[PDB]
Amino acid sequence: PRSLKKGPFIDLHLLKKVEVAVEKNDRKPIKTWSRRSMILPHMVGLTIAVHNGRQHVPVLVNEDMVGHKLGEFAATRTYR
Amino acid sequence: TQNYGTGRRKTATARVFLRPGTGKISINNRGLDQFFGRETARMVVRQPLELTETVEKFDIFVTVVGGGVSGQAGAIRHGITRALIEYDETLRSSLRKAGYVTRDAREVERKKVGLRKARKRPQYSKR
């Protein structure tokens, strides 16, 4: 998926909101509806409030999550 | 000299050229054994020759197009029948009794598309 000819992917608004927010370190969560963007080594340890579908759920970014996308950590269906 | 005949069976058109000789038998510029590999085709093409016992008298040159192994073999049989008739027009009764000059009109029935085969339907569960 997403062959190495066009390797990386990150949405422009998320990139500009995170790269700039790295300068003023983490004091707030990042609310973003995009789930298609991967996380990067430049975004290790941040707090992302990924959209579940009706509310935003927090995400604790770790160094071992770089390969996977944000949407894997947000549910779609409950099945309680 | 030489006689011409055309064969058609199961979408396989064949040209048959009867010539005097010693039965060299050439099909698409290769031998009969190299063409039909260990099947009934070798005799089924040769059957009209032995029916009228003239296998050794005629050299046969053949060109084939269309169809598969058995269809092309039936085409060569039909072509040899029609060519042999054109040469010695007195043995029509002998080949008619054998049913070789009768062209086989059985063509692949068109698929009743929606039925899985030309006639096979779904399983029809009634409830």
Partner: protein
């Protein structure tokens, strides 16, 4: 049910020169695999030739006569009573029954080298100890038990 059914004739066995063997080969064939079935039929024939000095065609003919039955039951219900009628087998039908039973019991022999299954079935059929002959004799014994309904309530 108006009688419509005509006769379609298939007679071609050049490499051995017979007529019954082509019809038997048609019973061995599965999914139109005539080329595969032909070498298995001949594969089980050369083994019979190896086993017995006599020509395998005579062995096959003797096997057909030892499996082909004479009479068989016919379950026709009178409309209130389940009766069975032993009816004389037609001369044309009796060969097909033997050719169908032979392959059917050959498939379940359970040996290796599938042609060997049919070769063994044909060898046993010439003596009378084969499973096909036992099935023939079982139906024959059933026919005598059913002989009471030969013509009455039949």
């Amino acid at each position: 049910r108006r009688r419509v059914a005509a006769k379609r004739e298939v007679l071609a066995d050049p490499k051995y020169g017979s007529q019954i063997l082509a019809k038997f080969m048609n019973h061995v064939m599965e999914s139109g695999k005539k080329a595969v079935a032909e070498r298995i039929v001949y594969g089980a024939l050369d083994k019979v030739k190896e086993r017995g000095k006599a020509d395998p065609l005579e062995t096959f003919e003797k096997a057909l006569d030892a499996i082909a039955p004479l009479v068989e039951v016919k379950s026709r219900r009178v409309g209130g009573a389940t009766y069975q009628v032993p009816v004389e087998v037609r001369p044309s039908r009796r060969n097909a029954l033997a050719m169908r039973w032979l392959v059917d019991f050959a498939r379940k022999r359970g040996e290796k080298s599938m042609a060997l299954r049919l070769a063994g079935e044909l060898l046993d059929a010439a003596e009378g100890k084969g499973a096909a002959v036992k099935k023939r004799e079982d139906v024959h014994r059933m026919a005598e038990a059913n002989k009471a309904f030969s013509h009455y309530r039949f």
